[PDB]
Every structure is written in C-alpha cells, then in structure tokens.
Ligand binder design. Structure first.
Ligand SMILES: Nc1ncnc2c1ncn2[C@@H]1O[C@H](CO)[C@@H](O)[C@H]1O
Ligand SMILES: Nc1ncnc2c1ncn2[C@@H]1O[C@H](CO)[C@@H](O)[C@H]1O
Ligand SMILES: O=C(O)c1cnc2ccccc2c1
Ligand SMILES: O=C(O)c1cnc2ccccc2c1
Ligand SMILES: [K+]
Ligand SMILES: [K+]
Lengths: 330, 330
C-alpha cells in the first residue's frame, strides 16, 4: 500500500473574491481571464477599488488536492504560508478537507499570498495575485517520505514565478521517479506558459513530467500557434499522457496515438469559472490513481469541473464522491 | 440635509461559515439557531472540528448598515476591530459598500472578533462567537458629530455582552435625542434577551429606544411567555414602534394600537438564514428614513430578508435597490 494517491505542490493562496463589470477590468488594466502578478503596492491599490468580498482558501494545486480528498482519494500538499491569520485560514481549510499538510511557516513577513479575483457577469475570473510568503517555498519544504509514498506528484506551472520553488520540484521529480512514481504538471495559465515556454517543454521532453494538464489557451500558447490540431499533435509527442480541456467543449486525453474525447457537463448557468481546471485535475488524478481508464479519468475530471463552476469559490462545497456515485463513475 | 440616514453600532465580526449535519451541533453542545459566546480555547477547539469554511464580514449591525447602503441610503457604523488581517477585511468590506466606518483599532490584541457559523441542511444558522477586540468598544468610539447628523441610530442587544459598549450606547441616546433624532435597537437573540431582560425593558420604557426589532423567539423571551399575542400587546406598550418578524409568516409592525401585517416574499429555497433579521432591519430603516409608510417599511424589510436567506453569507451580493425597483417598492 502507498500512503498517498496524489501529492500536489503549489503557491499557497487565500482568494479574495468579488464581482465586477466589464469596464472595471479595462479601467484597472487587469488582463481578463488571466493570472496577473502584482506587487504589495498594487495589491493595496486594487483592494481599495474592489467591492465587498468573500474569502476562501485557494491556490491552484491546493484546490486540486482538496478535490482529490473530496472524491475520496488520499491527498497531500506542499505550499508555504505565513504565520498570520490568512495562513491559519489556509492551513485549517486544507487540513479540514483531509489533506496532509505540514509545510511550516517561516515567519510573518512576507505575509500569506492572496489573490483578488474579479468575476465578471459571464462568469469569467480575472486574478490578481500577490505571492507574499510563496516566494519562500524551496527544497527545505520537500517532505521526501511523502513524495516517495505518493502515486502521483502534481505541480503548478505557476511555481516558475517564485524564485526557488523549481528547485523543490526538481527534487520531487528525482524522488518520485526513483520510487517508480509519476510526475504531473499543469501549464496553469497562457501568460505563465509564455514566460516559461522553453522550461516547460524541457520538463516534458526530459521526462521529468509524465502527465501534463493544459487548456486550449495554454496549448496554443505552448506551441505559439492558432492551430489547435497542431497543438494536440505536438503535446502528444512531448509527454507520455496529456489531458487537454476545452471549456464547454469538454476534454481530450492523449497517449501516444490514442485520443479519448469526453463531453463537458451541460451547465444551467456559469456562476464562477474559478477552479475549473484545478478540479478537472482532481477528477482525472483521482480516477488515474484508482486504475480507471483514461476516458473515465476524463469523465471524472469533467464532472468535478462542472460542479465547481456552478458555485462561487474554488473548492466544491458539495460532495464530489456522492456526485460521482450518482453519475455511475463511483 | 442630514449626513446619514442610519448609524448602526455593534460587535464588529468576521464570519467563518461551514455546513454541518444535525448531529454535529449535538455532539459539540452548540445551541441550534442561537448566538453562543465562546472563549479563545473553545474557539480553537471548535475550529479544529469545523470543515472547510468561507469567510465573510459579519456583525449584525454591520450587516444592517451594509444593507441600508445597498438599498441607496446613507449609512455609518461604529464597531471595534483589531489591527490585524481580519480587521483589515472587515474594514474594507464595510467601507467598500459605501458605509462611513472610522472606528480606530486599539492594537493587534485582542484580535478581531470572529464567529464560526454552522449552517444545517434546513438552512438554520448556529453561531459561535469569540468577541476579541469587541470588548474594547467604549464611549471613546462615539463620533458625536455622526450621531448628531444621523436620522436613526440603531444598535444591537448583543452589545450588552462586552463590558463598556453600553456606555457608548447611552451616550448615543443622549446625543441622538438632543438633536431630535430617533434611537433603535434589536433584541438580537433570545438568550441575549434572557441575559439582559430588565436592562432591555428599561431602555424602552425610559424612552432611550424609540423603535424595537424582535423576532418571535425574542419577543417570547422578553416577556417570559408562551403567548405570542401577549408578547405583541406588551411590546407595543413598551416602545413607540415595534417591528416583529415571524420567519416564513412575514412580520407585524406595531405603533400604539396600530398593527400592520406584512407577508414574507416567495423564495427559491432557504440556503442560509444568516443575516435575515439584520437585513429586515436594513429594509425597514431604509424605508423609514425615506418617509415611507410603516407597512411599506415592513415590505422593504421582508424583501431584503428574503433575498439574504437565498445565499450563503450575511450580506446580499446582489443589488437590493434593483430588487426593490423590480418588486415595485422602489
Ligand atoms: N500565481 C498563482 N499560483 C497558483 N495559484 C494561483 C495563482 N494565482 C491565483 N491562483 C489560484 O488559482 C485558483 C483558480 O485556478 C484560485 O483559487 C487562486 O487562488
Ligand atoms: N455576539 C455577536 N454580536 C453581534 N453580531 C454577532 C454576534 N455573533 C454573531 N454575530 C453576527 O450575526 C450575524 C447574523 O445576524 C452574523 O453575520 C454574525 O457575524
Ligand atoms: O506566441 C503566441 O502565439 C502566443 C499565444 N498565446 C499567448 C497567450 C499569452 C501570452 C502570450 C501568448 C503568445
Ligand atoms: O423565561 C422564559 O420563558 C424564556 C423563554 N425563552 C428563552 C430563550 C432563551 C433563554 C431563556 C429563555 C427564557
Ligand atoms: K467556482
Ligand atoms: K445568508
């Protein structure tokens, strides 16, 4: 037996969520649908203009770990918060979901990362992230026994922004592979891909990453193309398994020459897209580590993603395991 | 012209909200549907057992002020937070709603008040409140110019728990009445009524309070009776105006021998009753300060209350003014 199905690694963030009109994004030069990095001064400025908000634990990989636990899988998470109230919230929420979380805060400054997420009327989310304590994550935060004992270790492309997180990831890759485990990454965001295009390709081609998650926008960015079919062929050539999401058009799972298309759930109304990709990865990786077919992994991913976009906030407040049972995915 | 329609005064609290099953309340000796005061040790214990949560600025009077501002009235708030992250969240949310809020924190300790609110499947809410920095609210926090320039000053019965807040309220009553303004209170909670029964009756009978808000449970507690008609007759004898809510049975507004019955609005589902009474007071006091009939104040209250119970969290995330316009209450 193994201790963990999925270890995830990412920027530990608390989300600050509000609604806005379309003009707000233009007025404040916020790139729509993207992760916009911001400094402390810009954080203060944007917050001063933001309406009344709700807070909820976030972080892309944090959400993915929570989702795996919610489905009934065994999950762990590495990510660095500060010894402050936001860090206490983050710690509580992830542990309360039944995710192993033991990364120790290093101090009160920089403070715990937060992301001001503006949700427009169409349900799109535009994130504005002050990394704070995330900049401190490094090799010292790798719990080697956890990596050794996890079927899959999954990490964010977003980790390439803070300075030393990549060193922790390279350590994880070494340990995972020495123990016959698999490594997975998400491309995270199309501008993130643009920042780290060559590095991401190298991760895949060198075999440090076995399973890659992308959406359409990320895949097009990765190969600098408007040809989605080219992007699919290239990504299949670059990694052992690729899971590519296409929003309302569902998803496609690629392995060598194999392609498995999955339909998206028909949605009544798109409330807030925050967490869609994260929860697709939850469903996929839960299925993968239970030995399910690639198609069924895709189905579980679409189920989880469809649920999270029908609520405000990034982590499903309902039972994913119950939903999967009703769906005959069990 | 006056600067403010409604000044509210209360315990400044950030809510930590989670769903639980019925047995959780019993196992943890949480009194269902009530405000349960807790110390620091008990807060740590309950939080350790609480599921993943979301945070939202709360405080009964805070919610009421926010609701008045939402409807288009001019609101102000007195309430004390700490110089910490939770206090910064509280400060942001109330000011971002357009409420005047200038109560200065006295340091970082005691920390900002928080309430762990457990919502059961029936939508009832059971609150567990650590008062923290609320214990420091005192006469020093009365902005006399704001009280002088507000049509109505409204305060929580909950203020009788912290040690010095009542002195600030007595100062408010003096200033308000010297400037020809009106004072209002909510009975807050049936156990709060039980703690301060004599003091609350005296506030009304001495004329320090002109307009009283109660629900059925609070009115029955106030007069220690199982007879609701007796409670209505007695409350009408004790205060100039009484607004008494009755959940799905709407409300009754009493003035001398005048009685005005108002129906609850049709709702999709009871998602979370948190803030129902607070927002009833918002709608009522908005109407009242706009010169509306007592019946129309009741209707505005039932509208605001009905909206808030159909969402998670204590402050409506949608426009109350727009809903009022659509409902023909305008
Ligand atoms: N730079 C970042 N790194 C990792 N996660 C992020 C970043 N910015 C925003 N997020 C998270 O992305 C999630 C949605 O995918 C949100 O819950 C938010 O916390
Ligand atoms: N002791 C208290 N005093 C004032 N407000 C409170 C108290 N406990 C809980 N609340 C608030 O009551 C609101 C619901 O009426 C919640 O938003 C919560 O913050
Ligand atoms: O080079 C491109 O074609 C390309 C495609 N998509 C992008 C998205 C974000 C940033 C750069 C991109 C660049
Ligand atoms: O004295 C009573 O009749 C009475 C009624 N309701 C209550 C609710 C809470 C606490 C005491 C109460 C006391
Ligand atoms: K969401
Ligand atoms: K509510």
């Amino acid at each position: 037996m193994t201790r963990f199905d999925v270890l995830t690694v990412g920027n530990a963030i608390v989300d600050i969520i509000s609604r806005c009109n379309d003009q707000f994004l233009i007025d404040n030069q916020i790139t729509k649908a993207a992760m916009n990095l911001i400094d402390a001064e810009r954080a203060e400025l944007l917050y001063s203009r933001m309406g009344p908000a709700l807070e909820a634990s976030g972080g892309s990989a944090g959400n993915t770990a929570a989702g795996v636990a919610n489905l009934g899988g065994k999950a762990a998470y590495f990510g660095n918060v500060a010894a402050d109230q936001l860090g206490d919230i983050f710690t509580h929420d992830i542990r309360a979901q039944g995710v192993h979380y033991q990364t120790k805060p290093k101090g009160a400054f920089p403070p715990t990362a937060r992301s001001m997420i503006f949700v427009t009327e169409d349900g799109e989310r535009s994130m504005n992230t002050y990394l704070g304590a995330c900049v401190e994550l490094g090799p010292e935060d790798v719990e080697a026994d956890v990596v050794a004992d996890a079927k899959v270790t999954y990490f964010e492309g977003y980790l390439w922004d803070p300075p030393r997180a990549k060193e922790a990831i390279l350590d994880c890759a070494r340990i995972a592979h020495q123990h016959g485990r698999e490594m997975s990454m998400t491309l995270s965001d199309s501008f993130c891909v643009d920042r780290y295009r060559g590095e991401f390709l190298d991760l895949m081609r060198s075999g440090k990453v076995d399973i890659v998650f992308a959406n359409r926008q990320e895949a097009l960015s990765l190969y600098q193309t408007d040809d989605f079919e080219e992007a699919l062929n290239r990504i299949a050539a670059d990694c052992k398994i690729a899971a590519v999401t296409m929003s309302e058009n569902g998803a496609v799972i690629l392995k060598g020459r194999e392609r498995y298309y999955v339909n998206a759930i028909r949605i009544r109304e798109v409330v807030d897209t925050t967490g869609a990709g994260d929860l697709f990865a939850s469903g996929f990786l839960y299925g993968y580590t239970q030995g399910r077919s690639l198609e069924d992994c895709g189905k579980l991913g679409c189920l989880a993603a469809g649920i999270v976009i029908q609520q405000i906030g990034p982590r499903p407040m309902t039972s994913l395991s119950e939903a999967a049972k009703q769906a005959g995915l069990i």
